[PDB]
Amino acid sequence: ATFVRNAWYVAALPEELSEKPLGRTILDTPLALYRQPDGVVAALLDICPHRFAPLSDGILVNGHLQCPYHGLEFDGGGQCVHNPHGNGARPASLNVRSFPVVERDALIWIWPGDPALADPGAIPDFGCRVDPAYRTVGGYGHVDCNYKLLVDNLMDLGHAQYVHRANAQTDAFDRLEREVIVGDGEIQALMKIPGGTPSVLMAKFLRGANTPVDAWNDIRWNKVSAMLNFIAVAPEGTPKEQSIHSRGTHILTPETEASCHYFFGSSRNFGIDDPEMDGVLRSWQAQALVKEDKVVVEAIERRRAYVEANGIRPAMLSCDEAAVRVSREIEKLEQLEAARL
Amino acid sequence: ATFVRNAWYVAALPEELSEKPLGRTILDTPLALYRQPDGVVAALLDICPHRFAPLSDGILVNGHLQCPYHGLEFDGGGQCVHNPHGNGARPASLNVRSFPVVERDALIWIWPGDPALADPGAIPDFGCRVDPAYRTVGGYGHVDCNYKLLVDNLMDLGHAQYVHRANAQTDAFDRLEREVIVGDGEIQALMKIPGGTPSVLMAKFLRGANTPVDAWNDIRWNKVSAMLNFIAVAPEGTPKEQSIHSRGTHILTPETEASCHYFFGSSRNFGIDDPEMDGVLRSWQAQALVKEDKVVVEAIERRRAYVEANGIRPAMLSCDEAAVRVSREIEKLEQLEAARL
Amino acid sequence: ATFVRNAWYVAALPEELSEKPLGRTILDTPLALYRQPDGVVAALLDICPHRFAPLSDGILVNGHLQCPYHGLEFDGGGQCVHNPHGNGARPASLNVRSFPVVERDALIWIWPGDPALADPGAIPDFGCRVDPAYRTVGGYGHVDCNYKLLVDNLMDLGHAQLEREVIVGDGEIQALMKIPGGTPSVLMAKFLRGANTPVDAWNDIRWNKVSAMLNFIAVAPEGTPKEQSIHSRGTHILTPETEASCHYFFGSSRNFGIDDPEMDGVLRSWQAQALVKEDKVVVEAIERRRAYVEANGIRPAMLSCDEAAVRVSREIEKLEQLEAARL
Numbered sequence A, B: 001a002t003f004v005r006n007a008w009y010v011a012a013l014p015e016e017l018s019e020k021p022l023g024r025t026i027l028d029t030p031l032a033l034y035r036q037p038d039g040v041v042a043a044l045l046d047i048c049p050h051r052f053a054p055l056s057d058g059i060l061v062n063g064h065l066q067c068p069y070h071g072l073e074f075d076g077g078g079q080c081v082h083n084p085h086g087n088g089a090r091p092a093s094l095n096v097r098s099f100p101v102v103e104r105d106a107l108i109w110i111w112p113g114d115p116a117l118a119d120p121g122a123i124p125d126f127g128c129r130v131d132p133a134y135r136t137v138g139g140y141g142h143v144d145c146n147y148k149l150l151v152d153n154l155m156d157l158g159h160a161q162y163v164h165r166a167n168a169q170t171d172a173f174d175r176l177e178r179e180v181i182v183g184d185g186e187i188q189a190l191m192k193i194p195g196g197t198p199s200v201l202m203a204k205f206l207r208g209a210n211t212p213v214d215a216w217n218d219i220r221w222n223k224v225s226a227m228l229n230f231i232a233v234a235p236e237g238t239p240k241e242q243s244i245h246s247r248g249t250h251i252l253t254p255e256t257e258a259s260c261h262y263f264f265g266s267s268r269n270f271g272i273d274d275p276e277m278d279g280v281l282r283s284w285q286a287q288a289l290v291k292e293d294k295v296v297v298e299a300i301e302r303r304r305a306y307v308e309a310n311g312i313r314p315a316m317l318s319c320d321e322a323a324v325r326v327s328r329e330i331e332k333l334e335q336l337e338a339a340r341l
Numbered sequence C: 001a002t003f004v005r006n007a008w009y010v011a012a013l014p015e016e017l018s019e020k021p022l023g024r025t026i027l028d029t030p031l032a033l034y035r036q037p038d039g040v041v042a043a044l045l046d047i048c049p050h051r052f053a054p055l056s057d058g059i060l061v062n063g064h065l066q067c068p069y070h071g072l073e074f075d076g077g078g079q080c081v082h083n084p085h086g087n088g089a090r091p092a093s094l095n096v097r098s099f100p101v102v103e104r105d106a107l108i109w110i111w112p113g114d115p116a117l118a119d120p121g122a123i124p125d126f127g128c129r130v131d132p133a134y135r136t137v138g139g140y141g142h143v144d145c146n147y148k149l150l151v152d153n154l155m156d157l158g159h160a161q162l163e164r165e166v167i168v169g170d171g172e173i174q175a176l177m178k179i180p181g182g183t184p185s186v187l188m189a190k191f192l193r194g195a196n197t198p199v200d201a202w203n204d205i206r207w208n209k210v211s212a213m214l215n216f217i218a219v220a221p222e223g224t225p226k227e228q229s230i231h232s233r234g235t236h237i238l239t240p241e242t243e244a245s246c247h248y249f250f251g252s253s254r255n256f257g258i259d260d261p262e263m264d265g266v267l268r269s270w271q272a273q274a275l276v277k278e279d280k281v282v283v284e285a286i287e288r289r290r291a292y293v294e295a296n297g298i299r300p301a302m303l304s305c306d307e308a309a310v311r312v313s314r315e316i317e318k319l320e321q322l323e324a325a326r327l
């Protein structure tokens, strides 16, 4: 019920779309997502103007989505291009809502609010995902929790030390150094674990290479819920700019008030042509983000009723600065909109 | 929550009942339906007056339904005929509600509203179901949608062109001619598809007959949600009367506000003694009515919250006349009751 | 939504707890139940004060439960004993609620209400469960019905077909039934292979504040004190989970065939000792009909066998009102 509608959200990964429509709900709005014959992606309200049937269950005819119930056909703009009934007239009332959609950086961005306020120049920058110098692998995940819980999770990558201990635990955690940068529509949480033994996973990034290492876990947040992290590890004490790293795509899109879509990926500049390294990253993604994080956040969502019924508020720790700031920016965006209508 | 209680509804097909009670919910009312030893069907509120146990889980004793919890026995009138506890007294408070029920035309009709207003002369006529000149086959189906969505579906038989695309397909759909006839508690939609290629179904009807054909697809609606259609097809261009036909039973009974029972059947006057034609009708029903229709309407029900939250109203086409009229008669009946009671 | 919070409820059987926390909901309150290294059971609100993660999914560190999300560690009192972040300060806001818990009679009792009113002297007496003269076997069961339906069932003395007698005390109610000789079938199956000749049967049940019951099933030759008879005291305790679901703790404490594995298996069966499948179908079915009975104005029609149940039911209702009246 409480969403920030005026903003770009990822609705799907390119590989998920085709001429066969995908039905997906974004911010409590059912959408029919498909790629037209010319390759351009279209996003229509998944509700036929005639009798509300799911257009996503239909097929393309002459490149146009055909409602499976009574045959009305629509173009990517939501305009009804064919009515096989009676005089076959096509009054404006037969047009269906179409959403602004942009395919960029191997992501399908959608604007669920006022289409007049849709500005592609405001789409977060995830260029590394299509940078030939980087190798990108990732996937999709559905989680039964409010998207904000996952934003919190990610804005404190420090949870890895426990929730993903088997892979990310470090014996230098106590020596953690952290800063928070607030910018124009952007917040960054910087983390540096100095001179520690590489973690199981960082050891894999360096290929079983132990030796005293330096690690960085930064994360950038952009308006609403799009984040890109910086996971780097380098021996002794080398520069952070000359180190091996992975820029992780971590984007959340609310489905319902208590559920969300999770788009994740890894864009690395090492072992670029190595199927095994691809396996490590995918294995990590499947185990950490899709299961371990899922377990915790889904359990937290189940306890929301109790915390709200009672007057329980969270007790912040020294690692929550970035998360609280992001959280407050989102709350402000919610309030602005609530004040628009 | 919103039902027209003062009307006869089909609660079950005769073959569904026996001495073993059937538990079924009609208009949010749980019923225990069974056939007594003398063969007369009884309908009791499926809630024991003692501690609310489901009488439908009990068995008959001396022809009386015995509650499975503590043994109170009831007769078809809902009267408690035996109390095995203490002095075994049977105060009126132990009687359970019994509903007016009539077995006619191979259908079990029940009156869930004001019992004093129940009048068997008001039961729709489905005589063809027990006419020795007709061969009748059918069945039952449960659907997760408000019953009105299925009334719309049936009153707008045209959808078969796209929904049943593989069976009811017709190359004369654009040469369609409709005719609506209004009446008291009765509305009829007539449709004709002359001089065209028969669909696979009609083909199987005329035993794979060659040459063009003249079909007939009418449907009659009676107060609330009981319909009988007329599917006729004839060699080339012959009369509508002498034509081989099937009178289809299509009756809906709401279960909950978002779910309903669907009683269907075919009463044909051709291939009467042919197990195969039987298979042709049973297959169609299983395929078209239970599978294909189910999908479309259940998806529409899931989109109700969104259309209501927003102010979306349906955009009617030239094929919606009969459906809109029926829909308006039902709405009026709802209003009368809402007023009346 | 409607619970009597100020009372002791069984949250688990001893054998269910260990250093690996058990997550369980009691009266709509999620709990993390575990046994510390010294063997003492602890019960914490299963909600970390930091960001609400389930402590029940964590593990013990130095004998302290560690939240699986960001590592805060707590002691059995709910006090935060370690914060691995920043200056590692531990302000009182990091403490988590801890519930009064007592392990007695091979049962884990918890007080979910006003912690100030909790008094261990008020815990029902189930001593037979740890009496060396008795052999006790039992188990756990979950049921999708309001706990009151099971209280009714039990107060209707194993109805699966001096004399009558119902005693009403304070926070306690007993229903006694002594049946000389027999008419349908007596002597009982287990009691069979012991004590013959004319006998006397016994089937009583004791109810204690809210939903804890202990029954008495016994038999002895002609005239004989129910004390020295061949008997079994059945533990039948219910603890609401949600308004429409509950936990069922059951057990048998017998003084016969004490060293005989044969009987344990049957005396440990959920269907044979707590509720036959056929009856479980009934209480869950009754729960599904609550909406209809409430929507309409349907009230139950009592029979001659409902006396004990109605009385217990009325004592519970009074307890509900007392608490409600507070707030």
Ligand SMILES: COc1c(Cl)ccc(Cl)c1C(=O)O
Pocket: A157, A160, A168, A201, A217, A229, A231, A246, A247, A248, A249, A265, A266, A281, A284
């Ligand atoms: C969750 O953030 C990560 C951490 Cl903490 C370590 C390694 C990786 Cl690949 C990621 C990632 O971006 O998925």
Ligand SMILES: COc1c(Cl)ccc(Cl)c1C(=O)O
Pocket: B157, B160, B168, B201, B217, B229, B231, B246, B247, B248, B249, B265, B266, B281, B284, B285, B289
């Ligand atoms: C759905 O109504 C029908 C149509 Cl449109 C064509 C053929 C048949 Cl058999 C039926 C039927 O009664 O099921």
Ligand code: FES
Pocket: A048, A049, A050, A051, A052, A053, A067, A068, A069, A070, A071, A072
């Ligand atoms: S509901 Fe889409 S054409 Fe009828």
Ligand code: FES
Pocket: B048, B049, B050, B051, B052, B053, B067, B068, B069, B070, B071, B072
């Ligand atoms: S609930 Fe039917 S006899 Fe007791």
Ligand code: FES
Pocket: C048, C049, C050, C051, C052, C053, C067, C068, C069, C070, C071, C072
């Ligand atoms: S939620 Fe428990 S330490 Fe953060």
Ligand SMILES: [Fe+3]
Pocket: A153, A159, A160, A163, A164, A288, A289, A293
């Ligand atoms: Fe994580």
Ligand SMILES: [Fe+3]
Pocket: B153, B159, B160, B163, B164, B288, B289, B293
């Ligand atoms: Fe259909």
